[PDB]
Paper text:
Pun g 1.0101 also crystallized in the P21 space group; however, the asymmetric unit contains four protein molecules. The model was refined to 2.4Å resolution. The protein molecules forming the crystal have the sequence that corresponds to Pun g 1.0101, and all four chains include all 93 residues. Similar to Act c 10.0101, the structure of Pun g 1.0101 is stabilized by four disulfide bridges formed by residues Cys4–Cys52, Cys14–Cys29, Cys30–Cys75, and Cys50–Cys89. However, the conformations of the protein molecules present in the asymmetric unit differ, and half of the molecules have a distinct conformation corresponding to residues 77–85. This stretch of the polypeptide chain controls the opening of the ligand binding cavity and corresponds to the Ω loop. Chains A and B adopt one conformation, and chains C and D adopt the second observed conformation. Despite the different conformations, none of the protein chains have a ligand bound; therefore, the crystal structure provides insight into the structure of two Pun g 1.0101 apo forms. In the case of chains A and B, cavities with volumes of approximately 370 and 340 Å3 are observed, and in the case of chains C and D, the cavity volume is ~414 Å3. The difference in likely modes of ligand binding for Act c 10.0101 is not only related to the presence of the conserved aspartic acid residue in kiwifruit protein, but also the absence of a tyrosine residue in the Ω loop. This tyrosine (residue 81) is present in Pun g 1.0101 isoallergens, and it was shown to significantly change conformation after ligand binding.
Lipid transfer proteins (LTPs), also called non-specific lipid transfer proteins (nsLTPs), are known for their ability to bind and transport hydrophobic ligands. The biological role of nsLTPs is still not well understood. They transport these lipids between biological membranes primarily for defense, including structural adaptation, antimicrobial activity, and pathogenic resistance. We elucidated the crystal structures of Act c 10.0101 and Pun g 1.0101, nsLTP allergens from gold kiwifruit and pomegranate, respectively. These allergens both belong to the subfamily of 9-kDa LTPs.
Author numbering: 1 to 93
Write the structure that this text describes.
């Protein structure tokens, strides 16, 4: 299964943008999102990713969750659902 180390390494370039008002996505953040997409191909990998993101969120303030929800589509990755702290990781498919 993908580790929290793997998730952090792929989405670390997204953190400064995740705290901003929006605008142009850093290419390294889109690259990071593509890498994470490539690692999370099973339900458990997506559930692990969800749990790693929620855990890291408790240690970071100033996050623009409305902007984070749309980041995949801005990076060319089509996603059925929005990334949300509200969503239970146990219900991620």
């Amino acid at each position: 299964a993908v580790t929290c180390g793997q998730v952090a390494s792929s989405l670390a370039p997204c953190i400064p943008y995740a705290r901003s008002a929006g605008g142009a996505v850093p290419p390294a953040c889109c690259s990071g999102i593509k890498t994470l997409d490539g690692m999370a191909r099973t339900t458990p990998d997506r559930q692990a990713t969800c749990k790693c993101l929620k855990s890291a969120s408790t240690s970071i303030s100033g996050i623009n969750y409305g902007l984070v929800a749309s980041l995949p589509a801005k990076c060319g990755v089509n996603i059925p659902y929005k990334i949300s702290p509200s969503t239970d990781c146990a219900r991620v498919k």
